[PDB]
Amino acid sequence: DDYSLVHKNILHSEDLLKYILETSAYPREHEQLKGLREVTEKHEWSTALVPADEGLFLSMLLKLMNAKRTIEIGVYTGYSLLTTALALPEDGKITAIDVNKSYYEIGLPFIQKAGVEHKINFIESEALPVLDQMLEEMKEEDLYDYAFVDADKSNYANYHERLVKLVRIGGAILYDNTLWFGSVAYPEYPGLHPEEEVARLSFRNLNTFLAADPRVEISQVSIGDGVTICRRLY
Ligand X SMILES: Oc1ccc(CCNCc2ccc(O)c(O)c2)cc1
48 touches ligand SAH by CB under 6 A? yes
94 touches ligand SAH by CB under 6 A? no
Cα four-point dihedral sign 9, 13, 18, 19: negative
Interaction residues for ligand SAH, span 66-85 (CB under 6 A): 73-76, 79-80
Q: Is 98 annotated as a binding residue?
A: yes
127 touches ligand SAH by CB under 6 A? yes
Contact 123/48 with Cβ under 8 angstroms?
no
Contact 56/71 with Cβ under 8 angstroms?
no
**CA–CA separation, 116 and 11 (whole Å):** 33
**CA–CA separation, 103 and 127 (whole Å):** 16
Give the DSSP per-residue string, 26-63: GGGS-HHHHHHHHHHHTSTTGGGSPPHHHHHHHHHHHH
Please state at what angle helix 79-87 crosses helix 101-113, rounded to 10 degrees: 40
12 touches its own copies by CB under 8 A? yes
Q: Which is nearer to ligand X, 92 or 226 (CB)?
A: 226
Q: Which is nearer to ligand SAH, 100 or 121 (CB)?
A: 100
- From candidates 99, 143, 157, 223, binder to ligand SAH by CB under 6 A: 99
> Which residues make up the interface to ligand SAH (CB under 6 A)?
48-50, 73-76, 79-80, 97-100, 103, 126-127, 150-152
> What residues make contact with its own copies under the rule CB under 8 A?
8-13, 15-20, 23-25, 27-28, 53, 56-57, 59-61, 63-66, 170, 172, 179, 182, 184-186, 207-208, 210-212, 217-223, 228-229, 231
